């Protein structure tokens, strides 16, 4: 039983990486999978904030040697297991390759009875982002239809490909006003990556712009839980069906 | 007389997508519209967006400067309103882990292009990484852009806490963005003040609020600044009001430097000449 590992990323700030990570995790749990969600925004933790959780200890405690990784695990909704990050601990955003590797390696000790790990990455193209993305089997790029997000997503793809040997990427359009808007967005990325790179982009669909997501964030409850019948939640179910179909 | 003070503002906020770059671009344009000589630095070093919001196509960037291929003056672009822009790179990693020395070298380089300058606006990256903290500490005024969601409040607080705890920074300016009601900006400021009052020793200063405006969405699509493309929009009028406030912050006349106890080197306000 190999664990499916999905890194949710995108370069651009605020495109919905954390919302997608949280609600994809919940949707996969709804399909019957045993799911873990790692907050890899190591110094600006938001997974706990979106879920209204107040972690006593975090990955900060782990790295500083005050506790073991198993000791910081939190229970989220639907049985999802959460690994919480720190908020405001600067050292956590520039960890050595050794510390990053050590952390990733340490997950093998809490891998029991697990089907899927979802990893929520920070904004940007920094070492923490690249380290976690490189360590995943599937790279889910969250993109929205604005020139800055398209530009940032392309930059991250180019970087991961040219410096880190990554050659396959999943693309999810978030805050789309229509499914066709997402397809057109994917078409844009396909043309520029076709022209300059040798990579395989695979489209996963859209999460629509949905006021229910804004309401869910205010409530600090996952939209998938708080508004299970909303268009966004139904779209997360669809993405989960696709993810679950991917070869391990 | 014989030292002209320069205002230096770092626009930051921790949270991704809160409007740091939109605020940087449109504050710069609004200040230029008031008659100030403005420079705008894209300090999102590895994911440049200032050029993207303005529809500029740089041939050289900060990466070329830092890596010793050209000088800072060579990469300056003339933007709307006469704002001079220093463009960043897009997808060059060797930029989101510069050494403290390399950051220092970049900051030092601005002294060569300071003539005829009133204000430098610095657009920082998301997060609390070394690049962000270095550029924030290199400025005189730190402008946190915050919106009324728990994640923005939490991230803004985290940045304030780190700067206060680790670097002794005490005073911060706060600008609310994407507000949907007239009192939302002040209410948001109060939320942040509540948390910082309880746990920190800081002095927050409320600057104002930019409303959520569909005109910003349209401007970003057109790759034109909302201040230029929709000058009568609610967002653009708010940027005008905010620039008038920013412009009123007093600068020392003829800043000639002073000594401080247990500080070896003269301490001097940013200035030119
Ligand atoms: N499908 C959606 N519909 C409506 N609003 C959305 C949607 N997805 C995201 N949002 C909004 O976008 C905000 C940012 O989402 P978030 O998941 O925090 O993005 P992020 O990419 O993780 N941000 P960051 O980690 O700081 O770079 C949310 O708080 C909502 O306001
Ligand atoms: N006042 C506003 N009204 C409406 N939309 C806005 C407003 N300000 C920002 N936006 C939207 O928010 C998006 C993000 O703005 P942007 O200025 O790129 O934020 P940022 O903090 O610089 N992101 P990043 O650098 O990637 O962390 C914009 O592209 C617009 O969609
Ligand atoms: Mg996030
Ligand atoms: Mg930006």
Curated annotation (Swiss-Prot), chain A:
Listed GO MF terms: ATP binding; ATP hydrolysis activity
Binding, ATP: 12-19, 146, 174, 208-210, 214
Activity regulation note: ATP-binding allows dimerization and subsequent antagonistic effect against FleQ.
Pfam families, A to Z: ParA (PF10609)
InterPro entries attached to this UniProt entry: FlhG, MinD_FleN, P-loop_NTPase, ParA/MinD_ATPase, YlxH/NBP35
Null allele phenotype: Deletion results in up-regulation of flagellar genes that code for structural and regulatory proteins, leading to the multi-flagellated phenotype, which shows motility defect.
Highest taxon, organism lineage: Bacteria
UniProt entry keywords in alphabetical sequence: ATP-binding, Nucleotide-binding
GO cellular component, one term: cytosol
Subunit and interaction comment: Forms homodimers. Interacts with FleQ.
Family: Belongs to the ParA family.
Role noted for this protein: ATPase that plays an important role in maintaining flagellar number in Pseudomonas aeruginosa. Exhibits anti-activator activity against FleQ, the global transcriptional regulator of flagellar genes.
PANTHER family: CELLULOSE BIOSYNTHESIS PROTEIN BCSQ-RELATED (PTHR43384:SF4), SEPTUM SITE-DETERMINING PROTEIN MIND HOMOLOG, CHLOROPLASTIC-RELATED (PTHR43384)
Protein name: Antiactivator FleN
Species this chain originates from: Pseudomonas aeruginosa (strain ATCC 15692 / DSM 22644 / CIP 104116 / JCM 14847 / LMG 12228 / 1C / PRS 101 / PAO1)
Phylogenetic lineage: Bacteria, Pseudomonadati, Pseudomonadota, Gammaproteobacteria, Pseudomonadales
UniProtKB/Swiss-Prot annotation, chain B:
One Pfam family named in its UniProt record: ParA
Keywords carried by this UniProt record: ATP-binding, Nucleotide-binding
Knockout mutant characteristics: Deletion results in up-regulation of flagellar genes that code for structural and regulatory proteins, leading to the multi-flagellated phenotype, which shows motility defect.
MF annotations from Gene Ontology: ATP binding; ATP hydrolysis activity
InterPro entries, per database record: FlhG, MinD_FleN, P-loop_NTPase, ParA/MinD_ATPase, YlxH/NBP35
Binding-site positions, ATP: 15-22, 149, 177, 211-213, 217
Regulation: ATP-binding allows dimerization and subsequent antagonistic effect against FleQ.
One cellular-component annotation, GO: cytoplasmic side of plasma membrane
Main function: ATPase that plays an important role in maintaining flagellar number in Pseudomonas aeruginosa. Exhibits anti-activator activity against FleQ, the global transcriptional regulator of flagellar genes.
Similarity comment: family membership: Belongs to the ParA family.
Subunit structure of this chain's protein: Forms homodimers. Interacts with FleQ.
Protein name: Antiactivator FleN
Organism of derivation: Pseudomonas aeruginosa (strain ATCC 15692 / DSM 22644 / CIP 104116 / JCM 14847 / LMG 12228 / 1C / PRS 101 / PAO1)
